[PDB]
Amino acid sequence: NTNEALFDVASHFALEGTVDSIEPYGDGHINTTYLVTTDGPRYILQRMNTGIFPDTVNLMRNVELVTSTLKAQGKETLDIVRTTSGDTWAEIDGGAWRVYKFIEHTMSYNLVPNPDVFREAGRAFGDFQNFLSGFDANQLTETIAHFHDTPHRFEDFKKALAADELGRAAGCGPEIEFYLSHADQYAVVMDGLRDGSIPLRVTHNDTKLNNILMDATTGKARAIIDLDTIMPGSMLFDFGDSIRFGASTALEDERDLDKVHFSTELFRAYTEGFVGELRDSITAREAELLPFSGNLLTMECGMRFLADYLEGDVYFATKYPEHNLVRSRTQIKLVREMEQRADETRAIVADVMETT
Ligand SMILES: CC(=O)N[C@@H]1[C@@H](O)[C@H](O)[C@@H](CO)O[C@@H]1O
């Protein structure tokens, strides 16, 4: 979208000041996000990715339900700015757009800078599980099917591999072999959900560190800021995915793999914060799987990155041809380290469960 086009889009919303600029904000993989600067307040303007989220009406119904409930509890959350026609979003020139108020005086992190920040992230997402337990499974629509159904993701991967539409398979044999050889590990959470041994809960489903805003002065969690995948799942998806992104010593797309390690110190910090909020609620079987949920969600996301690479990068935004291969490689290195530290992560969870 050109500058003129974006100003036109913003004109559809009930903003409370004259727009001075609209500039790309962040490096999200999915939606297209802009910071709108006025002569007074600031706003986040987003074009929703309708290739990924085709059901905008149900997506926005979820977002409206979650934010209105948080507000009714006095909690800070994403504040939808309505269109001038009074709607929660608008279709404008072939795009689906929404506006949130910009949440001021915050810090957000694409990588853990210190254990305290990750411990606070643990508190925030653990607290968010208690919030989501207030909803029935049926109140929140699945916005994406099979979202953390790792065996289903693996079927998708094999289809991408078989098509090999760009002939990229030949250059990622070792990565393909990793996901093939780990196929026996993908079913554990889905099987437990299906047999009732793992409770079905409403979960956030994209608990990466940069989805919590911390207060710029105190560092206390202020608000969670991606509500697009709130829907039934397992607590293990939220824990495991937090560990995948945040217990890494490197960026998700770190090109130098010698920078990429799984840190048990960071794993412990997050576990302390998360289990601290949930200790009397977590089931024995959930606790048992906390360390492996890290391996599982990391393998699932890596497999998705590699599938996308093999499909010509149709899902995730990329900046260069091998971007998704580079992303997949970090996830592989992390899993390999998580495997080597399995006894230690088990002992960490036991100690936190005992301590809390
Ligand atoms: C809606 C969607 O696919 N979101 C994904 C999330 O699943 C994935 O873990 C992450 C990796 O950085 O990128 C996006 O946030």
Short description:
It comes from Bifidobacterium longum subsp. infantis (strain ATCC 15697 / DSM 20088 / JCM 1222 / NCTC 11817 / S12). By secondary structure, the chain is of the alpha+beta class.
Characterization of this structure:
By secondary structure, this protein is an alpha+beta fold. The protein has a domain at 115-355: Alpha-Beta Complex (Aminoglycoside 3'-phosphotransferase, Chain: A, domain 2), CATH 3.90.1200. 45% of the residues lie in helices and 13% in strands. The chain has helices at residues 3-11, 56-72, 115-132, 150-163, 173-181, 188-195, 235-246, 264-278, 284-310, 323-340, 342-355, and strands at 19-24, 32-38, 42-48, 80-81, 90-92, 95-101, 106-107, 201-203, 212-215, 221-224, 231-233. Strands 1, 2, 3, 4, 5 and 6 form a six-stranded antiparallel sheet that branches. Helix 4 (150-163) runs parallel beside helix 9, helix 7 (235-246) runs antiparallel to helix 8 and helix 7 crosses helix 9 (284-310). It is globular, with a radius of gyration of 20 Å. The structure holds 2-acetamido-2-deoxy-alpha-D-glucopyranose. The PDB classes it as transferase. Keywords: kinaase, transferase. The assembly is monomeric. N-acetylhexosamine 1-phosphate kinase_ATCC15697 in complex with GlcNAc. The protein is N-acetylhexosamine 1-phosphate kinase.
